[PDB]
C-alpha cells in the first residue's frame, strides 16, 4: 500500500568503532583511550576492544544482511586503523587489507557500500599533540587520510560521507561532557565547529580532484535537521527555538549545502566574543566545495523554551545561554532511554529539505530505537519479538513516505543498527539491532524486526 521510489536504499548503519573491535588496530581513538583510563564510566565495564567483532565477522554479517533484504550498508573507516604515520598519512597494511575485505564483501553480496570517514574517532595522539579538531594542522592530516581512502577504495566505493554528526563531536568533546576530553569550553567548541566544516569542504575538494575513475561518485556529510520545537508561540519561546535551530541545524547545513555560515549566527558569536578564526581563502574553499547529497539522522525530537535563568556570568559560552530543553506534558516516550517518540518530525525534516535546501538529494541515515533487557521478549523459539521496534520503524517510515509524496527528494532509509553494537558510554545497555548479538560469544540471531524489514526492503513498500 505505501510504495517507495525505485532504487531506494534499504539497509542499516553502524561505525568502525562501534562494530569492529580493536583487533589489529594500530592506534587508539578518543573512545579507546577513554575506556583505557576510566572503564567504570562504561556500562557493565564493556569497552570497545571487541565490540561486535566485525573485524572477524564482516563477511558473514554482510551475507546475513543480504539474506535479510539489505541493498546498502553504511559504516566508517577508522583513521586509527588505516593510517600508520599520521603526519605523512602512510598506510597500515593490515588496515588497508581490512577495509578491502569490507568493501569487497559488500559488492560480492550486492550491497552498495556507503562509507563515512569520521564517527567520533579522532586519534588520541592528535588530540595530545595538537588539540585535535582545535587544530587546522589536524584538519590537514584528516584530508591526507581522506585522500588515502579515495585512492585505495574509490574504484569500488562511490558513496562517501565526511563526518557523522559533527555538532555531536563539538558538544560531546567541548560543551556537555560525553566525549573525551569532556571539557567545557565554548570558545573552543565554536572553533572546532568551524574547523569541522572547513574539513568537510577540504575533503570534498580532495575527493573531486582525484583521478576520474575514483572521483565519479558522490560525497556528502551526515547531519541533524531535527526541529527545535518551541514550547509555545510566545515571542520568548520562539526566539529560543530560533536560536537553537541556528546553532544545532543551520551552522553545518548552511555550510554543507550553500557553502556559507548563517549570518545571524555569526553576529551572535561575534557579539558574545567567541567567533571562530577564519581566513578569506578558507571561506572561499567552503563556498566552492559543497555536498552532492546528505545523510540526515533522526532518532528523537528536541523541544526548547526560553531560558529559565539568565546567569550574571557563565563559566564558558554555551548555545544554552539562549534556550533550555523543554518537556511537553503528554509526550509519547521510550522509558528505558528517557526519549520522546515523535515520528512526525521526519515529515518536518523532509519538508525543510524540500523548501529550504533546494530539495537536494538526502537519505534518512540513522533511525532506530534502543531498549534494554531484550531477553524479556524472547518467545518459545528464542527469537526476540521486538514488536516495539517494528512499530517504531513503521511509523517513522510512514512519515518518510508522506514526505516523499509531498515532493521531498529522499532516496533511502538506513536503520540504526543492523546488528547490536557498542554505543559509547552506554556500551550494550540499550540494543538497537534488527539482529541480536550475544556480546560474550559474538553469535548473531535475527530478531522479529529483521524479518519485517526484509519484507519492506524486498517488496519496496509498507503495510
Interaction partner, residue 224 (ligand JAZ, Cl ion, none; CB < 5-8 Å by kind): Cl ion
How far apart are alpha carbons 161 and 74 in whole angstroms?
A: 10
How far apart are alpha carbons 176 and 396 in whole angstroms?
A: 28
The verdict on 190 binding Cl ion (CB under 5 A) reads no
Mark the segment that binds Cl ion (CB under 5 A) among 98-106, 216-224, 304-312, 337-345: 216-224
The verdict on 416 binding ligand JAZ (CB under 6 A) reads yes
Mark the segment that binds ligand JAZ (CB under 6 A) among 90-98, 255-263, 326-334, 423-431: 423-431
H-type alpha helices, 50-185: 54-67, 79-82, 93-108, 124-130, 136-153, 166-174
How far apart are alpha carbons 34 and 172 in whole angstroms?
A: 13
How far apart are alpha carbons 73 and 104 in whole angstroms?
A: 12
The verdict on 98 binding ligand JAZ (CB under 6 A) reads no
Instruction: Compute the least distance from the CB of residue 166 to ligand JAZ, in Å.
Output: 11
The verdict on 72 binding Cl ion (CB under 5 A) reads no
Interaction partner, residue 167 (Cl ion, ligand JAZ, none; CB < 5-8 Å by kind): Cl ion
Nearest to 167 by CA among 277, 250, 274: 250
Instruction: Compute the least distance from the CB of residue 59 to Cl ion, in Å.
Output: 32
Mark the segment that binds ligand JAZ (CB under 6 A) among 139-147, 180-188, 310-318, 422-430: 422-430
Per-residue exposure over 60-70, b if at least 16 CB sit within 10 Å of its own CB, e if not: ebbebbbebbb
The verdict on 430 binding ligand JAZ (CB under 6 A) reads yes
The verdict on 366 binding ligand JAZ (CB under 6 A) reads yes
Say whether 366 is catalytic.
yes
The verdict on 370 binding ligand JAZ (CB under 6 A) reads yes
The verdict on 167 binding Cl ion (CB under 5 A) reads yes
The verdict on 180 binding ligand JAZ (CB under 6 A) reads no
Bridge partner list, 304: 230, 325
- Looking at the Cβ atoms of 165 and 436, the one nearer to ligand JAZ is 165
Instruction: Compute the least distance from the CB of residue 420 to ligand JAZ, in Å.
Output: 10
Place of cell 579515495: 150
Interaction partner, residue 318 (ligand JAZ, Cl ion, none; CB < 5-8 Å by kind): none
- Using a 10 angstrom Cβ sphere, with 0-12 exposed, 13-18 middle and 19 or more buried, the burial of residue 210 is middle
Interaction partner, residue 423 (Cl ion, ligand JAZ, none; CB < 5-8 Å by kind): ligand JAZ
The verdict on 246 binding Cl ion (CB under 5 A) reads no
- Looking at the Cβ atoms of 27 and 118, the one nearer to ligand JAZ is 118
CA dihedral 425, 444, 432, 14 (to 10 degrees): 70
Angle, alpha carbons 389-336-397 (nearest 5°): 25
The verdict on 417 binding Cl ion (CB under 5 A) reads no
Bridge partner list, 333: 340
The verdict on 423 binding ligand JAZ (CB under 6 A) reads yes
- Looking at the Cβ atoms of 141 and 419, the one nearer to ligand JAZ is 419
Q: Which residue is catalytic, options 165, 171, 320, 436?
A: 165
- Looking at the Cβ atoms of 367 and 408, the one nearer to ligand JAZ is 367
Nearest to 17 by CA among 80, 104, 103: 80
Strands 410-415, 362-367: pairing is parallel
Q: Which residue is catalytic, options 20, 254, 282, 366?
A: 366
The verdict on 161 binding ligand JAZ (CB under 6 A) reads no
Backbone torsion region of residue 417, taken as left when φ is above 0, otherwise alpha when ψ lies between -120 and 50, otherwise beta = beta
How many residues sit in the footprint of ligand JAZ (CB under 6 A)?
12
Strands 302-305, 324-325: pairing is antiparallel
Of 189-228, binders to ligand JAZ (CB under 6 A) are none
How far apart are alpha carbons 89 and 92 in whole angstroms?
A: 9
- Looking at the Cβ atoms of 255 and 434, the one nearer to Cl ion is 255
As given in the structure block, the three cell numbers for residue 234 are: 510566545
What is the separation of C-alpha 138 from the centre of its chain, rounded to a whole number of angstroms?
21
How far apart are alpha carbons 136 and 130 in whole angstroms?
A: 9
Say whether 380 is catalytic.
no
Determine how many CB atoms are found less than 10 A away from the CB of residue 99.
23
Q: Which of 9, 33, 299, 362 binds ligand JAZ (CB under 6 A)?
A: 299
The verdict on 316 binding ligand JAZ (CB under 6 A) reads no
- Looking at the Cβ atoms of 195 and 224, the one nearer to Cl ion is 224
Place of cell 556500551: 427
Q: Which residues are catalytic?
A: 165, 366
Positions in the binding site for Cl ion (CB under 5 A): 165, 167, 223-224
List residues binding ligand JAZ (CB under 6 A): 15, 18, 164-165, 297, 299, 366, 370, 416, 423, 426, 430
Amino acid at each position: 500500500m505505501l510504495a517507495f521510489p525505485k532504487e531506494f536504499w534499504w539497509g542499516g548503519a553502524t561505525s568502525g568503532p562501534q562494530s569492529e573491535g580493536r583487533f589489529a588496530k594500530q592506534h587508539r581513538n578518543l573512545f579507546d583511550y577513554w575506556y583505557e583510563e576510566e572503564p567504570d564510566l562504561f556500562y557493565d565495564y564493556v569497552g570497545p576492544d571487541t565490540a561486535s567483532d566485525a573485524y572477524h565477522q564482516i563477511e558473514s554479517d554482510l551475507t546475513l544482511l543480504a539474506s535479510l533484504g539489505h541493498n546498502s550498508y553504511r559504516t566508517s573507516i577508522q583513521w586509527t586503523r588505516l593510517i600508520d604515520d599520521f603526519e605523512q598519512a602512510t598506510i597500515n597494511p593490515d588496515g588497508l587489507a581490512y577495509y578491502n575485505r569490507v568493501i569487497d564483501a559488500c559488492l560480492a553480496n550486492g550491497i552498495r557500500p556507503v562509507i563515512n570517514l569520521h564517527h567520533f574517532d579522532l586519534p588520541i595522539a592528535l588530540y595530545q599533540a595538537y588539540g585535535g579538531w582545535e587544530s587546522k594542522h589536524v584538519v590537514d592530516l584528516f584530508v591526507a587520510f581522506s585522500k588515502v581512502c579515495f585512492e585505495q577504495f574509490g574504484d569500488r566505493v562511490k558513496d562517501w560521507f565526511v563526518h557523522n554528526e559533527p555538532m555531536v563531536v563539538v558538544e560531546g568533546s567541548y560543551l556537555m561532557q560525553f566525549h573525551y576530553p569532556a571539557i567545557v569550553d565554548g570558545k573552543k567548541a565554536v572553533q572546532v565547529a568551524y574547523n569541522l566544516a572547513l574539513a568537510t569542504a577540504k575533503v570534498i575538494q580532495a575527493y573531486r580532484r582525484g583521478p576520474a575513475e575514483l572521483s565519479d561518485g558522490r560525497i556528502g556529510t551526515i547531519l541533524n535537521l531535527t526541529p527545535a520545537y518551541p514550547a509555545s508561540q510566545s515571542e520568548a519561546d520562539m526566539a529560543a527555538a530560533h536560536f537553537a535551530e541556528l546553532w544545532n541545524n543551520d551552522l553545518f547545513m548552511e555550510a554543507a549545502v550553500h557553502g556559507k555560515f548563517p549570518e545571524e549566527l555569526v553576529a551572535v558569536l561575534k557579539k558574545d566574543g567567541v567567533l571562530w578564526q577564519s581566513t578569506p581563502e578558507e571561506l572561499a574553499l567552503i563556498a566552492e566545495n559543497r555536498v552532492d547529497y546528505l545523510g540526515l539522522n533522526f532518532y528523537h525530537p528536541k523541544r526548547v523554551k526560553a531560558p529559565d535563568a539568565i546567569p550574571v556570568i557563565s563559566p564558558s559560552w554555551s548555545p544554552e545561554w539562549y534556550y533550555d530543553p523543554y518537556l511537553m506534558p503528554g509526550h509519547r516516550m521510550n522509558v528505558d532511554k528517557g526519549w520522546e517518540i515523535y515520528p512526525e518530525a521526519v515529515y518536518d525534516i523532509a519538508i525543510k529539505m524540500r523548501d529550504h535546501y533546494d530539495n537536494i538529494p538526502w537519505f534518512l541515515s540513522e533511525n532506530g530505537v534502543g531498549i534494554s533487557g531484550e531477553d524479556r521478549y524472547r518467545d518459545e523459539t528464542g527469537q526476540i519479538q521486538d514488536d516495539y521496534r517494528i512499530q517504531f520503524l513503521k511509523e517513522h517510515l510512514t512519515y518518510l513516505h508522506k514526505g516523499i509524496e509531498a515532493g521531498s527528494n529522499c532516496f533511502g532509509y538506513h536503520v540504526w543498527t543492523p546488528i547490536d553494537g557498542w554505543s559509547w558510554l552506554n556500551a550494550y545497555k540499550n540494543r538497537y539491532g534488527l539482529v541480536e548479538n550475544n556480546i560474550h560469544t559474538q553469535v548473531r540471531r535475527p530478531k522479529a524486526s529483521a524479518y519485517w524489514f526484509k519484507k519492506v526492503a524486498t517488496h519496496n513498500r509498507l503495510i
